PDB file of C-alpha atoms in Angstrom:
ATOM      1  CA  UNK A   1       0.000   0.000   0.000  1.00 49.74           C
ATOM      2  CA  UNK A   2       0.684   3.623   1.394  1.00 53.63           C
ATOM      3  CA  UNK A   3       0.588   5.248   4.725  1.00 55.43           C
ATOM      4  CA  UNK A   4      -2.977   6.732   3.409  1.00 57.76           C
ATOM      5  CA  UNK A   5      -4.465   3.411   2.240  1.00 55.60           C
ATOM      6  CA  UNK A   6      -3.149   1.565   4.984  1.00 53.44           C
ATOM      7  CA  UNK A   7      -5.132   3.929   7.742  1.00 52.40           C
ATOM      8  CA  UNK A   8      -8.402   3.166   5.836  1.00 49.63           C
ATOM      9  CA  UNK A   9      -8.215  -0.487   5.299  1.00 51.42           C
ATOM     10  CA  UNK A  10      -7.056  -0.875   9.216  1.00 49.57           C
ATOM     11  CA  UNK A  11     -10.060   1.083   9.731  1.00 51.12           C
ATOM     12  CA  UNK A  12     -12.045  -1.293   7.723  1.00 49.98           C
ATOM     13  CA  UNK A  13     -10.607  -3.977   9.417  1.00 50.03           C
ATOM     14  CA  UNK A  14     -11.689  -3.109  12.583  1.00 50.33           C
ATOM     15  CA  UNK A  15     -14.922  -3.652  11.500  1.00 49.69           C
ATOM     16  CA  UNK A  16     -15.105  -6.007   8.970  1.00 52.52           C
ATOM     17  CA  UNK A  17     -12.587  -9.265   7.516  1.00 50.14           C
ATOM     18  CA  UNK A  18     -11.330  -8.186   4.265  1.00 53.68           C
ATOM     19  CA  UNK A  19      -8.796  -9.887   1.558  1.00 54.27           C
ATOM     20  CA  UNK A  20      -6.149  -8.325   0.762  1.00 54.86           C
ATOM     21  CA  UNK A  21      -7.394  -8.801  -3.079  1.00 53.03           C
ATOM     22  CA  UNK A  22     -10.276  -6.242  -1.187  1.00 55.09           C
ATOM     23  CA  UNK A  23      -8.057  -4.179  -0.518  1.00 51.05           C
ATOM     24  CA  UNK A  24      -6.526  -3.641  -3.436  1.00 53.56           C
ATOM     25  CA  UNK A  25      -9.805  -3.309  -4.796  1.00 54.89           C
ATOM     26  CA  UNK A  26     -10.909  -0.613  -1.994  1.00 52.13           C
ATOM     27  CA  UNK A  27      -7.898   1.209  -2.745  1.00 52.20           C
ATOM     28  CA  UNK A  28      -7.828   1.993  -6.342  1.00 48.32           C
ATOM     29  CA  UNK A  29     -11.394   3.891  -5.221  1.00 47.70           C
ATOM     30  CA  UNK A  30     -10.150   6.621  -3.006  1.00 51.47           C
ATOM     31  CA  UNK A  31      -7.747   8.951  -3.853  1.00 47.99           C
ATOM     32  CA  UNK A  32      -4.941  10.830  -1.705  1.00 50.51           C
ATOM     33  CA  UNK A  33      -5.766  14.237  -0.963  1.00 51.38           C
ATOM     34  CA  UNK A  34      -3.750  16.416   1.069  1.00 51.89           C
ATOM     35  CA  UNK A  35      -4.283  19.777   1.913  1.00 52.07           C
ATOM     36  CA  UNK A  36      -3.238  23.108   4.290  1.00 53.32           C
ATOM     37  CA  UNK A  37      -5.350  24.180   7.016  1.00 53.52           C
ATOM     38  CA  UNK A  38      -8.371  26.489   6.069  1.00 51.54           C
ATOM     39  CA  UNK A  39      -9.008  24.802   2.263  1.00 49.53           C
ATOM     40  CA  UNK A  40     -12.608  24.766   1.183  1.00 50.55           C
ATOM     41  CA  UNK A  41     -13.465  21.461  -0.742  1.00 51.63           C
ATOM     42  CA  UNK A  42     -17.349  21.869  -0.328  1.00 51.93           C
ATOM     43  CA  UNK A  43     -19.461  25.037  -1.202  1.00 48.71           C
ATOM     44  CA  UNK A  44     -23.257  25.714  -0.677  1.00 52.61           C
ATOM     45  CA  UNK A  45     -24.382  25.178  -3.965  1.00 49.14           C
ATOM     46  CA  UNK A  46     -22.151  23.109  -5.416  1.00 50.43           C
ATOM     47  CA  UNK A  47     -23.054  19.673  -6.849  1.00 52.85           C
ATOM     48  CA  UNK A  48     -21.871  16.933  -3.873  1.00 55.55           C
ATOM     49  CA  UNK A  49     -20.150  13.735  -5.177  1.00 54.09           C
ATOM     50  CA  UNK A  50     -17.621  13.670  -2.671  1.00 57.72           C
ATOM     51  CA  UNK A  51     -17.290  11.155   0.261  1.00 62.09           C
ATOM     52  CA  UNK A  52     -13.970  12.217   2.944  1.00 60.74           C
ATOM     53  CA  UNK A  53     -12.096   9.556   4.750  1.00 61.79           C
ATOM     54  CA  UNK A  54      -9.706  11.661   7.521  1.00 61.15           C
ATOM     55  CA  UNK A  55      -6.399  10.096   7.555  1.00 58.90           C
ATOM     56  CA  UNK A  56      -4.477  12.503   9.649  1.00 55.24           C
ATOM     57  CA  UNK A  57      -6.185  15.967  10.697  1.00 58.54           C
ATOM     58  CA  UNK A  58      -9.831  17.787  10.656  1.00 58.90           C
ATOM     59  CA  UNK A  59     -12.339  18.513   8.520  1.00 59.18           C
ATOM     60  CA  UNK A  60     -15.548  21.134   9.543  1.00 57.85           C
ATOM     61  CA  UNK A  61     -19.008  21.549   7.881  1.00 57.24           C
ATOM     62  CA  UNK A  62     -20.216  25.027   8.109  1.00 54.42           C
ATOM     63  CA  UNK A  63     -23.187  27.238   6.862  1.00 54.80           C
ATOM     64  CA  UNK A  64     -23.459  30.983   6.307  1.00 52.92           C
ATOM     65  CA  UNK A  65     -26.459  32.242   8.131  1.00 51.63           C
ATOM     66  CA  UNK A  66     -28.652  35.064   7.363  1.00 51.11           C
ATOM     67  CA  UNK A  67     -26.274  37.546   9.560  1.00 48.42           C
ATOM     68  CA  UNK A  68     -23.450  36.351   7.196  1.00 46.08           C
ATOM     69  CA  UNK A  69     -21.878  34.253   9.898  1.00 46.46           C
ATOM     70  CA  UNK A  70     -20.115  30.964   9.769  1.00 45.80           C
ATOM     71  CA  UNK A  71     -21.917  28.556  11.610  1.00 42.33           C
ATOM     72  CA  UNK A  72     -19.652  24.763  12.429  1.00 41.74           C
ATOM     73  CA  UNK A  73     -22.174  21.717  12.506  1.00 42.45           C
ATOM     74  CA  UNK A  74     -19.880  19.451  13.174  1.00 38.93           C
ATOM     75  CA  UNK A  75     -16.147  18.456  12.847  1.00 40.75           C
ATOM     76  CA  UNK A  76     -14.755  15.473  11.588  1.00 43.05           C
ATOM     77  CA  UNK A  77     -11.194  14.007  13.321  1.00 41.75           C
ATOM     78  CA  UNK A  78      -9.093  10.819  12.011  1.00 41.27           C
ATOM     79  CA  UNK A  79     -11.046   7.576  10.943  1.00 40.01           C
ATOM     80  CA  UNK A  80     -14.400   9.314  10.862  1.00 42.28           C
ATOM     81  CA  UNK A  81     -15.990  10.489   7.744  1.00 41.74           C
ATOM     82  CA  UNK A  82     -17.316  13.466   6.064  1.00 43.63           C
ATOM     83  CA  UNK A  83     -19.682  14.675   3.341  1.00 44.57           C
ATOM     84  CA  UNK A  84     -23.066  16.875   2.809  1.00 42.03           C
ATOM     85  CA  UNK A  85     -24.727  13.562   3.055  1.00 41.47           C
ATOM     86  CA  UNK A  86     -28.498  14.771   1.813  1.00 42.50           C
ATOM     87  CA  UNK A  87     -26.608  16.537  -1.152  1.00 45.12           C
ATOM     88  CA  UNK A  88     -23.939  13.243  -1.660  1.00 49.24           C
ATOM     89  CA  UNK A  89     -26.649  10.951  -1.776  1.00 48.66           C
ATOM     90  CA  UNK A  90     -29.161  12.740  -3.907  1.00 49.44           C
ATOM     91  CA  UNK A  91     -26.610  13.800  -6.186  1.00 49.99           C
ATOM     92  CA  UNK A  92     -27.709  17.492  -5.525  1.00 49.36           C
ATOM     93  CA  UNK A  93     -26.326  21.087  -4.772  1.00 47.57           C
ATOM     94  CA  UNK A  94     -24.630  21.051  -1.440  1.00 48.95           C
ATOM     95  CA  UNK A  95     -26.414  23.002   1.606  1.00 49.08           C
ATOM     96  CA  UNK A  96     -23.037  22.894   3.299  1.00 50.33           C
ATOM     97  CA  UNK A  97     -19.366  23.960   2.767  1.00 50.65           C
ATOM     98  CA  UNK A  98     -16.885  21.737   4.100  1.00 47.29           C
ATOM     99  CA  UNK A  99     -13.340  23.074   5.148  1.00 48.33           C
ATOM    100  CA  UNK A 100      -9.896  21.629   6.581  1.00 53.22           C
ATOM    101  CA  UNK A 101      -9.511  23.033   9.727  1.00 48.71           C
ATOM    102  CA  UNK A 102      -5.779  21.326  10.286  1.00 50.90           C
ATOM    103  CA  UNK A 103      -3.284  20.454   7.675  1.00 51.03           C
ATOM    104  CA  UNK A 104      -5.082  17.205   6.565  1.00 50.99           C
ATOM    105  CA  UNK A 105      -3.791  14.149   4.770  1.00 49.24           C
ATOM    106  CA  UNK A 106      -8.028  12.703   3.284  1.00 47.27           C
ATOM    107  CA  UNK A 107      -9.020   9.895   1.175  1.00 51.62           C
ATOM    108  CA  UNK A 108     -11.684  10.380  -1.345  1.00 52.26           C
ATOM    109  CA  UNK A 109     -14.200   8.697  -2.764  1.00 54.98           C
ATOM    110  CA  UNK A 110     -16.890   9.368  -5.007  1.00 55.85           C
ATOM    111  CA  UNK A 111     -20.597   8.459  -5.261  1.00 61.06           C
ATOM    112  CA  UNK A 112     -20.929   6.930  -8.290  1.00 59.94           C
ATOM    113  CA  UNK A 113     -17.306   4.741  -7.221  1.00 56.86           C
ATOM    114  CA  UNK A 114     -19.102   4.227  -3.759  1.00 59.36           C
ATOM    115  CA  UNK A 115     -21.875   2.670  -4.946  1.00 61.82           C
ATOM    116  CA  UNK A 116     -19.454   0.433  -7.579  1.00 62.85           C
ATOM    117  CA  UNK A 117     -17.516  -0.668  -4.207  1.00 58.70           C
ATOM    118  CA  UNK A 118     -21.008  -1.809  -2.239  1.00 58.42           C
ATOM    119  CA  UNK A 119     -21.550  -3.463  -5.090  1.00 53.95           C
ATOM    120  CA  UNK A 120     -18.300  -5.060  -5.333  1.00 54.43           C
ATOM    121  CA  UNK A 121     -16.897  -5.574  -1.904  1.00 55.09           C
ATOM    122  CA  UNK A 122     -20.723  -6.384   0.272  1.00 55.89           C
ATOM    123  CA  UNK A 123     -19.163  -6.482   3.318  1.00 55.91           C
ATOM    124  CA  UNK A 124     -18.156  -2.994   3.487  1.00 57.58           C
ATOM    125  CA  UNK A 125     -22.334  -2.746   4.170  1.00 55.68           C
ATOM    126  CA  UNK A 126     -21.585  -3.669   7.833  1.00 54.06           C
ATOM    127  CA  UNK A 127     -18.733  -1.246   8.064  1.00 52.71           C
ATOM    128  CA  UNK A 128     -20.678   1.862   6.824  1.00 53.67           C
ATOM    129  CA  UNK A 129     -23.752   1.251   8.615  1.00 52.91           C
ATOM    130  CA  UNK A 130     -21.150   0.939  11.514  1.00 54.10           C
ATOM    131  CA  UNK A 131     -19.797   4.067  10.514  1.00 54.07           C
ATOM    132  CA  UNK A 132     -23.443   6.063  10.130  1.00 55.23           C
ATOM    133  CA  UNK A 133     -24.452   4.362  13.074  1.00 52.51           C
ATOM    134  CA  UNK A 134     -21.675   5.825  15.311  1.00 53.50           C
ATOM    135  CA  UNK A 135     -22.045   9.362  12.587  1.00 54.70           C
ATOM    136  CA  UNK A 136     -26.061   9.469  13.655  1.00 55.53           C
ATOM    137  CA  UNK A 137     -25.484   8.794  17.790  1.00 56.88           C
ATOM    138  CA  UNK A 138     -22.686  11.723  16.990  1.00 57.36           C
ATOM    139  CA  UNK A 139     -25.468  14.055  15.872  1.00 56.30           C
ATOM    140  CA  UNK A 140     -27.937  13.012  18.600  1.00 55.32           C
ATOM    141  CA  UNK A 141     -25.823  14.462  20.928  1.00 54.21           C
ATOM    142  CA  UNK A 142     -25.025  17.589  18.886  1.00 55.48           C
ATOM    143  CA  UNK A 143     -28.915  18.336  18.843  1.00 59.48           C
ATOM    144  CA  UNK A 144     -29.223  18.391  22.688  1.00 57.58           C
ATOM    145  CA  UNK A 145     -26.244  20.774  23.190  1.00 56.71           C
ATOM    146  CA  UNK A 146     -27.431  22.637  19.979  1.00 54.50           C
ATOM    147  CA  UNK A 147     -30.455  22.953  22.191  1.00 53.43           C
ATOM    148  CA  UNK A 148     -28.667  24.097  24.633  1.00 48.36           C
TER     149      UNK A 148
ATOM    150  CA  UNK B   1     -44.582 -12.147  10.209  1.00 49.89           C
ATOM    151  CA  UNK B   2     -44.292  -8.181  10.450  1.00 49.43           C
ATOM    152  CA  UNK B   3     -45.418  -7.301   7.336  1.00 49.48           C
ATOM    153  CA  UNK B   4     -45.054  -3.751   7.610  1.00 50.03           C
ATOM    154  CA  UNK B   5     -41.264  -3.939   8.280  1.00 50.62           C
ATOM    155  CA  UNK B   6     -40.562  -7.076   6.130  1.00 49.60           C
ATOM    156  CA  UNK B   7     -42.468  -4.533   3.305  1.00 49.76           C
ATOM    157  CA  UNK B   8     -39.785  -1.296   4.228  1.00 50.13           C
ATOM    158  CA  UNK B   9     -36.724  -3.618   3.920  1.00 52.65           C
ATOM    159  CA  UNK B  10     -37.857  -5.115   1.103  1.00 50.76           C
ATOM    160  CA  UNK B  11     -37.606  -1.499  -0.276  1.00 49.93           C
ATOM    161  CA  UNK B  12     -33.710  -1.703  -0.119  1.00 52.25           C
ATOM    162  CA  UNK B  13     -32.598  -5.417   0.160  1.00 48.67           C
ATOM    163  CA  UNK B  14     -33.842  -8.479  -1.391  1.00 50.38           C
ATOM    164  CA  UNK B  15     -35.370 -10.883   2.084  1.00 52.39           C
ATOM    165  CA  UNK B  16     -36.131 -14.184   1.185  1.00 51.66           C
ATOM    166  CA  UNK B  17     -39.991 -15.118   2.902  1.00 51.34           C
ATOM    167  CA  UNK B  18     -37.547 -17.500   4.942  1.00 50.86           C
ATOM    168  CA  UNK B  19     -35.509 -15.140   5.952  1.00 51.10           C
ATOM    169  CA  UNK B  20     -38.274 -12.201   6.627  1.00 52.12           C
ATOM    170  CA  UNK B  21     -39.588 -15.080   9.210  1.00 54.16           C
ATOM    171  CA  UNK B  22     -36.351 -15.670  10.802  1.00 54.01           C
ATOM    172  CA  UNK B  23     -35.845 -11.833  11.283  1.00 50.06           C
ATOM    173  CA  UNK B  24     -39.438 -11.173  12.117  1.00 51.45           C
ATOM    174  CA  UNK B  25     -39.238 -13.438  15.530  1.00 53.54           C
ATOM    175  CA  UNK B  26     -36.473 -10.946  17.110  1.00 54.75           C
ATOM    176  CA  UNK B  27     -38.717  -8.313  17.169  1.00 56.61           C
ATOM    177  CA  UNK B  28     -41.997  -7.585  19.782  1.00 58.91           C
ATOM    178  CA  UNK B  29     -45.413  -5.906  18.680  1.00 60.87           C
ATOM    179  CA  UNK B  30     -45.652  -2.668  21.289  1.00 61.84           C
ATOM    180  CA  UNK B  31     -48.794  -0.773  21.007  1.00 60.87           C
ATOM    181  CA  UNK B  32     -49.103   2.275  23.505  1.00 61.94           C
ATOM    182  CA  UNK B  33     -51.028   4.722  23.864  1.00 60.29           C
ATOM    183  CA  UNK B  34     -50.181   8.574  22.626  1.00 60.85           C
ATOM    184  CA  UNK B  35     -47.814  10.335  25.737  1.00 59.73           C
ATOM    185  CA  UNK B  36     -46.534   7.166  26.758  1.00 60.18           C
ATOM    186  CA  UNK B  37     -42.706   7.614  27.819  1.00 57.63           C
ATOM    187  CA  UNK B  38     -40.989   4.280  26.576  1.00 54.85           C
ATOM    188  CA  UNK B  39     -37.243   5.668  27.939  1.00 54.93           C
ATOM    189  CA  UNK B  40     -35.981   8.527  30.596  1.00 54.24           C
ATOM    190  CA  UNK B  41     -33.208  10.158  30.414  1.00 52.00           C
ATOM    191  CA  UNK B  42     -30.813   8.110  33.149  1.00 52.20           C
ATOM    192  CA  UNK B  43     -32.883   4.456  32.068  1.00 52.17           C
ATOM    193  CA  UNK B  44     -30.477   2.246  30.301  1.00 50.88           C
ATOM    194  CA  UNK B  45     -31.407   2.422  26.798  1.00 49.88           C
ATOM    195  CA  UNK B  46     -31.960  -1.171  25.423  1.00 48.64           C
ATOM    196  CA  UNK B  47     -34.237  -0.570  22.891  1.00 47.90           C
ATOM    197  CA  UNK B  48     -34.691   0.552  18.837  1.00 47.64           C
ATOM    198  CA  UNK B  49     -37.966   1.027  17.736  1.00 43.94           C
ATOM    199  CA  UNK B  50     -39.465   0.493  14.060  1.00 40.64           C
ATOM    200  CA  UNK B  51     -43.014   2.727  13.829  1.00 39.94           C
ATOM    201  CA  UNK B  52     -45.892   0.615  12.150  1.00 37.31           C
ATOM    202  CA  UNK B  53     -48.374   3.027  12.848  1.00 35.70           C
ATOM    203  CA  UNK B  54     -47.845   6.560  14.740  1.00 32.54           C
ATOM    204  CA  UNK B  55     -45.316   8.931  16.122  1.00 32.38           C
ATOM    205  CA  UNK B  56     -42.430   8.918  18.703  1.00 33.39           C
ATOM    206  CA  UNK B  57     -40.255  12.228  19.668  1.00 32.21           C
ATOM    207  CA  UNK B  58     -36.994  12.295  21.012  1.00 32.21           C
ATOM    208  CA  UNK B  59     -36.677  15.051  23.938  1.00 32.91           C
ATOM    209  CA  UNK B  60     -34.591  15.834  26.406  1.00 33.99           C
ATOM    210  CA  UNK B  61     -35.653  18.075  29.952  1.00 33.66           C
ATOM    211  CA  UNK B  62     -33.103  21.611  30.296  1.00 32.97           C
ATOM    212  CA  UNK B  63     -32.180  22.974  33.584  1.00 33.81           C
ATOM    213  CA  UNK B  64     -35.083  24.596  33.539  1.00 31.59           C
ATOM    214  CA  UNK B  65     -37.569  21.744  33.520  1.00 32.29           C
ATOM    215  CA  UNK B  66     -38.559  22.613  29.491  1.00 30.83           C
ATOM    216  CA  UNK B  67     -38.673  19.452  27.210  1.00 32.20           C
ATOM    217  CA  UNK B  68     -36.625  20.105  23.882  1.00 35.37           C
ATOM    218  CA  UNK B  69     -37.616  18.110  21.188  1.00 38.58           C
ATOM    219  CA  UNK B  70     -35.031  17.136  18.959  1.00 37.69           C
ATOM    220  CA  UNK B  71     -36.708  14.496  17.177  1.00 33.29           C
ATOM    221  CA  UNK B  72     -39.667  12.870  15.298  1.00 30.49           C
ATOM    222  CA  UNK B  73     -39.899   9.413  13.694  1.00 30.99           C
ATOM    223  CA  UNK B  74     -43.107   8.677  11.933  1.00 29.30           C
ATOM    224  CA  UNK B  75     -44.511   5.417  10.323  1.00 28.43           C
ATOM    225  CA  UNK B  76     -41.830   3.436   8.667  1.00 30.83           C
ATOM    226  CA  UNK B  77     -39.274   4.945  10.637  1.00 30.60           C
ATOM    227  CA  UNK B  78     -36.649   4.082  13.504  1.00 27.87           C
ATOM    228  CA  UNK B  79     -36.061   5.814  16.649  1.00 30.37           C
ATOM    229  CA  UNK B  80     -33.548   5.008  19.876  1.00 30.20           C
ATOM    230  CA  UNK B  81     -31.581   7.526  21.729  1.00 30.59           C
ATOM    231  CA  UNK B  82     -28.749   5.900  19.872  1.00 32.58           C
ATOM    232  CA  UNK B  83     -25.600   6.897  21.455  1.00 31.09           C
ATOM    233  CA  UNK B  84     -26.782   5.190  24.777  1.00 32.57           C
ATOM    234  CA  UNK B  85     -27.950   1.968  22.742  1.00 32.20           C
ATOM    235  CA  UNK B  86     -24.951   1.605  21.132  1.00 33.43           C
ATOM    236  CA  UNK B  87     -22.791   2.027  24.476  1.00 35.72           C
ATOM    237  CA  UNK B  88     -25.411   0.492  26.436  1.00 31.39           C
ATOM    238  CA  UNK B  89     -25.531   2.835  29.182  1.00 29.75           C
ATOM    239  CA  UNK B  90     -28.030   5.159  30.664  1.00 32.44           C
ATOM    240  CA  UNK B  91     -29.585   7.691  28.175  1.00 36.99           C
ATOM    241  CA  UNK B  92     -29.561  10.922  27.704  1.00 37.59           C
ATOM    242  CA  UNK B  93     -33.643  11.465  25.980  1.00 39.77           C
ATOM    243  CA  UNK B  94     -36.638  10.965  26.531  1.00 39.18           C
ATOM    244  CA  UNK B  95     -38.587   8.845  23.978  1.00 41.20           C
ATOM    245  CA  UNK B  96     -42.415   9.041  24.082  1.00 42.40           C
ATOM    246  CA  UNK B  97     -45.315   8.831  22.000  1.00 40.85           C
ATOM    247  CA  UNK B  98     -46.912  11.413  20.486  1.00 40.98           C
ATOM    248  CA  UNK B  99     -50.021   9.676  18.989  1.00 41.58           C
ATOM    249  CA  UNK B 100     -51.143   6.489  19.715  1.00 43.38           C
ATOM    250  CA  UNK B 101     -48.918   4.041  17.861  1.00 44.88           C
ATOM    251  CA  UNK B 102     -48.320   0.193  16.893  1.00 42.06           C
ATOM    252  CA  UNK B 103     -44.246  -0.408  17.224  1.00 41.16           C
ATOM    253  CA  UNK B 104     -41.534  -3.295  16.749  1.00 42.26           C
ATOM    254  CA  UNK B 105     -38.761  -3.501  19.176  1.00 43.52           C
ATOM    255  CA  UNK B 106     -35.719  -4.737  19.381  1.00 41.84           C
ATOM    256  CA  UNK B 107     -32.674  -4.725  22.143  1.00 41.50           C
ATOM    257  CA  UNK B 108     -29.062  -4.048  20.812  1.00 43.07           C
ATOM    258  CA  UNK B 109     -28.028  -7.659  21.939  1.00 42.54           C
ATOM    259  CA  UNK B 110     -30.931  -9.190  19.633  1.00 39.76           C
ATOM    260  CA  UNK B 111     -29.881  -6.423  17.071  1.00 41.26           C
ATOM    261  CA  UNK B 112     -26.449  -7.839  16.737  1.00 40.60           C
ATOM    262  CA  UNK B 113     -27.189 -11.674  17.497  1.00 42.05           C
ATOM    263  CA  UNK B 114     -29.998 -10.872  14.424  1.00 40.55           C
ATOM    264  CA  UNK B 115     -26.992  -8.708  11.774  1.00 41.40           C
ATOM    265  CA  UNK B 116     -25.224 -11.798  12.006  1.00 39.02           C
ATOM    266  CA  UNK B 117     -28.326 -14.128  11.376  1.00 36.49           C
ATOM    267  CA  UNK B 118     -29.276 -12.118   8.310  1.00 37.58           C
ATOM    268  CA  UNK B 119     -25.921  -9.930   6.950  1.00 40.20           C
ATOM    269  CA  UNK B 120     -28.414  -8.910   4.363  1.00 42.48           C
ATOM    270  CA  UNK B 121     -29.706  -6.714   6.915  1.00 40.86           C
ATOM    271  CA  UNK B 122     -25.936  -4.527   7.338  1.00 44.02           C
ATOM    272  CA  UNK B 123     -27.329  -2.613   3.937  1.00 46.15           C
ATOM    273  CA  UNK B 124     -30.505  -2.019   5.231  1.00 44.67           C
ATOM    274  CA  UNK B 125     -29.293  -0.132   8.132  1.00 45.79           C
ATOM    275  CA  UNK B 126     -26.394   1.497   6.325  1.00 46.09           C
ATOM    276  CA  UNK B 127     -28.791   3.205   4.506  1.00 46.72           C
ATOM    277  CA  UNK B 128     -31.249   3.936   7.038  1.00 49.60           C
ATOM    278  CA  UNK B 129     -28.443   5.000   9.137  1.00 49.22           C
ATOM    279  CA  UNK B 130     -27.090   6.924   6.550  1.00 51.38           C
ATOM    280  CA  UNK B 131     -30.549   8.853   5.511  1.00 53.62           C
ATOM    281  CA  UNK B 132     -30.861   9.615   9.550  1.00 55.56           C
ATOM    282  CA  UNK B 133     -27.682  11.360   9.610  1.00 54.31           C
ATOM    283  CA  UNK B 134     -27.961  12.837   6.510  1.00 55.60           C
ATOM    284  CA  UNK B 135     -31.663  14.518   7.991  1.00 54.42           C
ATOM    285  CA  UNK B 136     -29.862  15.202  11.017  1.00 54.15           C
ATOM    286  CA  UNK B 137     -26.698  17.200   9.339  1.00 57.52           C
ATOM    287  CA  UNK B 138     -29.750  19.198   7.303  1.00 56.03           C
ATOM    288  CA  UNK B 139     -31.755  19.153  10.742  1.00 54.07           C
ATOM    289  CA  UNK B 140     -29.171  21.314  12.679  1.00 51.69           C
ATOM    290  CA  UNK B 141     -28.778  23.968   9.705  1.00 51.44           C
ATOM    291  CA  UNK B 142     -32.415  24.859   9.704  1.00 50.04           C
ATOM    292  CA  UNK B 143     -33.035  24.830  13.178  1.00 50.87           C
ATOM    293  CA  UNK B 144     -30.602  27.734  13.720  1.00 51.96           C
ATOM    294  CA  UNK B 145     -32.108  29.517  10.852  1.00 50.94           C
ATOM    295  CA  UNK B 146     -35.893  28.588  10.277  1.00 50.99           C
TER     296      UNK B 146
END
């Protein structure tokens, strides 16, 4: 592998078994992305068809709200993921920009490929819902202190 | 056989009528009546609930004794507090009943004994885990603004 690859298929592997013909396979999916502290890579607006993997560093979703203020839904630290899921999924104009907040070192993925790798590799079913599972209890949370 | 909730997975994964009996005995028919609390905040959360028929809230109690909802689910939908299911420890909401509803339960230990029974199940819940975060991302955007 790399450094990068290796991080997500441990990950995986946490989770899930996987060959290491799956991994090769995983791999060739999600690209290397690294990038300074303070990069957008997600606008408001902007078609979503990217899925983030945090290898090293953070990532932040943020709106603008009517007073033109930056407002941080949530943050997303090594081995958890990040996207404008309603947007991703639905193929749609994002309602969120996402933002490094560290130097990051990301993996990739689009939807179209994600769907391809479900497809491909079935077990990695039980590692997202494991992932969205954890993602959703995450946001629970957020909601009660947001109400706060 | 829980027809309504063999019928919603059947929307995303293909259940043999085998199968949809195997995974239909790990669940129990609940029917209560609307503003029944089913979990307190402090209660160790053991259950996930599938609405057949009704409406659940999530909602916790502030320091000042005023219930914040945070949280519907409606017919065909799950609800748990799910941080506290997942950790199995005492939750933080409140889960009661808004109208009078028919529900399927399920404890996390049956929830995992059953995703290994039926793995067909792992991408049924990826993607209803997936749509609930997804709604919950878009949730906390317009409840600052709207």
């Amino acid at each position: 592998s790399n450094a990068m690859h290796t991080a997500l298929i441990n990950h995986i592997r946490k989770f899930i078994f996987l060959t290491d013909e799956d991994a090769g396979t995983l791999s060739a999916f999600f690209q290397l992305k690294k990038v300074r502290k303070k990069e957008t890579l997600l606008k408001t607006g902007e078609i979503c068809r990217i899925n983030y993997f945090v290898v090293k560093g953070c990532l932040r979703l943020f709106f603008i709200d009517e007073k033109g203020i930056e407002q941080t839904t949530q943050f997303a630290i090594e081995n958890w993921w990040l996207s404008d899921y309603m947007a991703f999924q639905k193929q749609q104009p994002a309602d969120f920009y996402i933002q490094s907040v560290e130097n990051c070192e990301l993996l990739s993925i689009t939807y179209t490929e994600q769907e391809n790798l479900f497809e491909r590799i079935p077990a990695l079913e039980r590692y997202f819902r494991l992932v969205y599972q954890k993602s959703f209890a995450a946001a629970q949370l957020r909601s009660k202190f947001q109400h706060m």
